[PDB]
Paper text:
To further explore how PIP2 participates in the complete substrate transport process of BTR1 and prove the connection between PIP2 and pH sensing, we attempted to solve the structures of BTR1 with the R125H mutation or wild-type BTR1 prepared under acidic pH, which may both disrupt the interaction between BTR1 and PIP2, and succeed in achieving resolutions of 2.96 Å and 2.94 Å, respectively. Intriguingly, two structures are nearly indistinguishable in conformation (RMSD = 0.250 Å), and both lack the densities of PIP2. These results suggest that the disruption of PIP2 binding site and acidic pH can both lead to the dissociation of PIP2. Non-PIP2 binding BTR1 occupies a 3D space of ~100 Å × 55 Å × 85 Å. Compared with the structures of BTR1 in the outward-facing state, the distinct features of the non-PIP2 binding BTR1 structures involve that the NTD has undergone a significant twist, as well as an apparent conformational change has taken place in the TMD. Analysis of the TMDs using HOLE2 shows that the substrate binding sites of BTR1 in these two states are accessible from the intracellular side, suggesting their inward-facing conformation. Disruption of the PIP2 binding sites (BTR1IF/R125H state) or acidic pH (BTR1IF/5.5 state) both turn BTR1 into the inward-facing conformation. Protonation of PIP2 under acidic pathological condition or pathogenic mutations exist in the L site of BTR1 lead to the disruption of the interaction between PIP2 and BTR1. Thus, we hypothesize that PIP2 molecules participate in the pH sensing process of BTR1 through passively changing their binding affinity with BTR1 under alkaline or acidic pH. Here we suggest that PIP2 may participate in sensing the intracellular pH by changing its affinity to BTR1.
BTR1 (SLC4A11) is a NH3 stimulated H+ (OH-) transporter belonging to the SLC4 family. Dysfunction of BTR1 leads to diseases such as congenital hereditary endothelial dystrophy (CHED) and Fuchs endothelial corneal dystrophy (FECD). BTR1 shares a similar membrane topology with other SLC4 family members, with its substrate binding sites located in the central cavity between the gate and core domains. The TMD contains a core domain (comprising TMs 1–4 and 8–11) and a gate domain (comprising TMs 5–7 and 12–14), resembling the arrangement of UraA25.
Author numbering:
A (entry chain A), B (entry chain B): 105 to 121, 131 to 160, 173 to 256, 264 to 306, 336 to 522, 569 to 640, 645 to 887
The structure:
């Protein structure tokens, strides 16, 4: 072995408040795969024994030794996760006494190439030869450290355009809030009204064409909204004894998505039915059965009261308090939703076994095949989804696999269970081939009960919709257009009134699908941390065409319901539920901290928040979060409808708990470190 | 973000051909988890505002910035895989003008702690403060760069012992080969005879006690030899129409393992039946059925001829030519073995479906449950095995998971399929509760045929045994005791004669279990490359107690045949075959190159052999290897016994092909880079 001396030092960003800009040599579309070839081409561009000195193996270039660059500059940032390097660019420096004049070469690679640790996705290489080099390297790093400038340089097609862009960039671098009634809605409408044409003409016309990306994301959204829509329709049909069918769920989802895409601010939010909504509909069905009330009328009245409360919240600008919402409560809610998905799948398979395996109406074969198909669908979907994080696959391959993991698994296992195992008939969701509910035919006592239930549902809707909207409107997503929280809530209430009046299932912003929609509709910079791909969004196109097309396709899918879309057996839908439950915990810090018990604290990056905070306080915070999650499960997943209807109240209550009690029992600094 | 300047430079290993050795301060068993605490303790040991200067965030220690060490020294080596850092130690340097005298502090951590990017498993921290620092840091790095010296320092218990060890280490650092008949056997016996007591008294007595490690590895070996032994016994019973039972396979494996452990050199090699051996036994059964020859007599004669040829090879010292063996041929053979395992599992499940699902004697339920159990066993075993590579799990946790993955999966799914699904009876391996074969009652023509078949089997045995022995005797394993190839081959021939005379299935060195046995019986230094744990063996204990105990336990397991060990259904054994097939390709470079078509070449480390070699030549080599593998599969996996009996010949032929033809069509430099 050979000893290596690594020296790290800061460099102040150049303060612009040039000759080498014009004298720089630009290489575009470099197809070389190795560092040696790229550097040889870059050096030849100047006009060789000069490439050898660039690395540590200076003096013994023939013998096989460690081949590492000597002087490099990169962008670095500090975060709770650790030290994140800007791996999209690299600046190599070489001070050669033989040379007489400074030389600068900027090379843009066709594809991102690993160029070392913390440079796994280099696309720009800035080689600076000096006869100092420090000043030129610092100024070029300062110019290249901008996230948008790198994308602008990527968009350039010619060397002259590259130099002009560089010159242009250098020159350029040189309480009581709720008192106003309806202020938030008016502000959101004013913000997002003038941008409507823009929203509809972002990628269709202009310098950048997004037709292919728009089509691909439209297909993604259509599939990822239809398949969960079918699963939720089947679940509701099982829960409501056929009151809400799969056809009703599909129609409601299509209408709601179309209305939201057409007439909402922040169109990137996707409306879909959720597991807690199914649980609450089950609560309504149980209450109606107990009190002999018509399901349709009671459901319509509950939806009407929920929409009324949501409109009251929107008009009074309550959404602002959602700024106090922290990540811990969000992750607790997400884990509860995943647990509800898992329990729905388990209940479905248990019912299948009870009806078929135990003969409580060849049933054993059907039950075993159902279990096998559900587990296999889950496994295949999870594997195809996790292939997205592989840093060695082509970007196209690992974005198609992410895009078409669940659809591929569903199709493959539907074929397996309907053609490979056609001799074993199994369960399929009901389909009997939209009348307004008789709201007037209901007692006043039932109206008051619906009022209370709608209040609880409105709290649930407020929390969920604002959570997903905040996720979509995160600062790291780089959304130029303004936010629309109150107008979005009002439109959600309106469309929910419309859906409830016709008995269609409720819908709100979908947590798993909205960030996925944003990512599919965004340009990202690949980052490799611990052998996994992480995406840094640079530009989101922010168009309504994708959501509108997805909604229209989902609506048109009603014609494929009888003959197609029914060969998908119920176990495939349960596997879809399991896949959603597992894949909704990708960035869950609560799950990470829970697993930390089985992991090693000292194995995390030196600057990771886990290592920074004492393990005792981390465990205390995890225990408090787990206690909150257990209490949420206890109320919101019991057999008692009267106590299953209360879980929105405790969802509201956790926010005051996190805001008040936890800082009193846990130090504020540690909570700030963990949450951020 | 803040620009970072990384400077890399060589440092010549100190040439010893001291005061600071005695003046150094030693800290032992440091339980601190963060860098700040460790460095604070180390600085306090001298007797604070000095810890801040050690990192790049000098001048702004309060504001949250990137917290990286400034001057660090590490051990680095170059390999075809890439640049491998010595992550077990780190030397931090700080030149402070305030200080008046040099200071050195050596801290040993209780557990390996990530301390960087290429410092994921640091256990020794050498902090050098200077008022130069370069000389002291270089000499300490040179002393610590030794792999065995780090283990010796770990073994020390007190500061005085640590200093004495440091001082002692510093002082210390200051053709025609086959003509002799039987020379190899005599040399091996002379080498390995005096070390017998040592072999039996390595960890039992002395400074280091290995009782716990010996017990754990004995349990691992027992389970990993019994379960595949049962699977192979069932496969042979299916193939040979009950001629070779599971009881016979267990007895033969136990006797052979005991004999090999007792009276062989290099006892770390594990003898077990293999898939090609099962295929060849099937060939023998088919030939006997075709020619109406007694299976036992023909099998015994074939084994006798195979042993005679193996003894001839051992006495004439042919094993030496195995040095010409390359990694490409080894990996082709391993992939062929895995494919044979997969086809055996597929044939078993196809037969189960044909008998039960199609009723060609509730069968559909049994077939579907068989498929589900096999797939689930494969999945669980693979997951528990792959958890071994997680860099965040505790070393004990991942070591146990690797040790008890297959046994845990087998037990869990046997319980599931025998208790959870007890209503669905399914296939179980035959067991009817050891007579010498009537060799004298066989025709001369059958004797000549058995001679030819035994010649082919002897070539197969030579290749397989020498391959596994070379894997066990790899230089990187650090085996102090000498190698024994010819004596091992002679003993293998003797025990094979003994086994064949009684009709027991043949056995030779097991490729998947011998390296695993070595690893379980070895101390390793953890390395994290691309987020995966890689082990560097420092010391292998090299004892026969583990293999002897495993063989004795396997033999004693015959008493657990009737009531235990039969609830394991055949699909569990097929899942075991699949698990072995998938887990035998961990380091397969042929599989890596085949998958490279779907991967990105530029995403590999800069110094990886994949990027160094042009992709065209990599693809040509992969295509040639795949063609050889396809020919091997075609000959050794067809329905014709006369052509299924020839695959050992082409296994032999592939070595001349690799040695002669490939260098002619592919450049020698690229082949050397890829193979090494």
């Amino acid at each position: 072995c050979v000893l290596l001396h690594t020296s790290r030092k800061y460099l102040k960003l150049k303060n612009f408040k040039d000759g080498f800009l014009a004298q720089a040599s630009i290489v575009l579309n470099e197809t070389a795969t190795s560092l040696d070839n790229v550097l040889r081409t870059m050096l030849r561009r100047f006009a060789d024994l000069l490439m050898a000195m660039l690395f540590t193996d200076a003096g013994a270039p023939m013998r096989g030794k460690v081949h590492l660059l000597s002087d490099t500059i990169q962008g670095v940032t500090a975060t709770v996760t650790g030290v994140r390097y800007q791996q999209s660019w690299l600046c190599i420096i070489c001070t050669m006494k033989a040379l007489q004049k400074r030389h600068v070469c900027i090379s843009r690679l066709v594809r991102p190439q690993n160029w070392g640790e913390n440079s796994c996705e280099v696309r720009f290489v800035i080689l600076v030869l000096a006869p100092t080099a420090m000043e030129v390297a610092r100024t070029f790093a300062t110019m290249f450290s901008d996230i948008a400038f790198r994308q602008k340089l990527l968009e350039t097609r010619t060397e002259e355009e590259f130099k002009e862009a560089l010159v242009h960039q250098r020159q350029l671098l040189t309480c009581k809030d709720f008192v106003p009634f309806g202020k938030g809605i008016r502000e959101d409408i004013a913000r997002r009204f003038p941008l409507y044409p823009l929203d509809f003409t972002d990628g269709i016309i202009g310098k950048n064409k997004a037709v292919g990306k728009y089509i691909t994301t439209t297909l993604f959204l259509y599939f990822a909204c239809l398949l969960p829509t079918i699963a939720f329709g089947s679940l509701n049909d099982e829960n409501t004894d056929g009151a809400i069918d799969v056809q009703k769920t599909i129609a409601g989802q299509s209408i709601g998505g179309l209305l939201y895409a057409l007439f909402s601010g922040q169109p990137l939010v996707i409306l879909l039915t959720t597991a807690p909504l199914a649980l609450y509909i089950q609560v309504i069905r149980v209450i109606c059965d107990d009190y002999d009330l018509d399901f349709n009328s009671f459901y319509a009245w509950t939806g009407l009261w929920n929409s009324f409360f949501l409109a009251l919240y929107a008009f009074f600008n309550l959404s602002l308090v959602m700024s106090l919402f922290k990540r811990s409560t969000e992750e607790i809610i997400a884990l509860f939703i995943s647990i509800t998905f898992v329990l729905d799948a388990v209940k479905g398979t248990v019912k299948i076994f009870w009806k078929y395996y135990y003969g409580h109406y060849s049933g054993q074969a059907t039950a075993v095949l159902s279990l096998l198909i559900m587990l296999g669908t889950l496994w295949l979907g999870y594997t195809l989804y996790q292939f997205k994080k592989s840093p060695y696959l082509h970007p196209c391959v690992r974005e198609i696999l992410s895009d078409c993991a669940l659809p591929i698994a569903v199709l493959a296992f539907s074929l397996i269970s309907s053609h490979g195992f056609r001799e074993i008939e199994m369960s399929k969701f009901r389909y009997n081939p939209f009348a307004m509910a008789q709201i007037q035919s209901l007692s006043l006592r039932a109206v008051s009960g619906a009022m209370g239930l709608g209040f609880l549902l409105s709290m649930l809707f407020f929390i969920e919709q604002n959570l997903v909207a905040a996720l979509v409107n995160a600062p790291e997503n780089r959304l130029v257009k303004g936010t629309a929280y109150h107008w979005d809530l009002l439109l959600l209430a309106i469309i929910n009134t419309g859906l409830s009046l016709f008995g269609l299932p409720w819908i709100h912003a979908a947590y798993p699908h909205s960030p996925l929609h944003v990512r599919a509709l965004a340009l990202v910079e690949e980052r490799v941390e611990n052998g996994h791909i992480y995406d840094t969004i640079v530009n989101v196109k922010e168009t309504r065409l994708t959501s509108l097309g997805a909604s229209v396709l989902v609506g048109l899918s009603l014609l494929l319901l009888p003959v197609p879309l029914q060969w998908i057996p119920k176990p495939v839908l349960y596997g879809l539920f399991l896949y959603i439950a597992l894949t909704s915990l990708d960035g869950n810090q609560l799950v990470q901290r829970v697993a930390l018990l089985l992991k090693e604290q000292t194995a995390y990056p030196p600057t990771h928040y886990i290592r920074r905070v004492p393990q005792r306080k981390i465990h205390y915070f995890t225990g408090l979060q787990v206690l909150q999650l257990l209490l949420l499960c206890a109320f919101g997943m019991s057999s008692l409808p009267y106590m299953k209807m209360i879980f929105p109240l405790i969802m509201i209550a956790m926010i005051p708990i996190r805001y008040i009690l936890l800082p009193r029992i846990i130090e504020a600094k540690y909570l700030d470190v963990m949450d951020a």
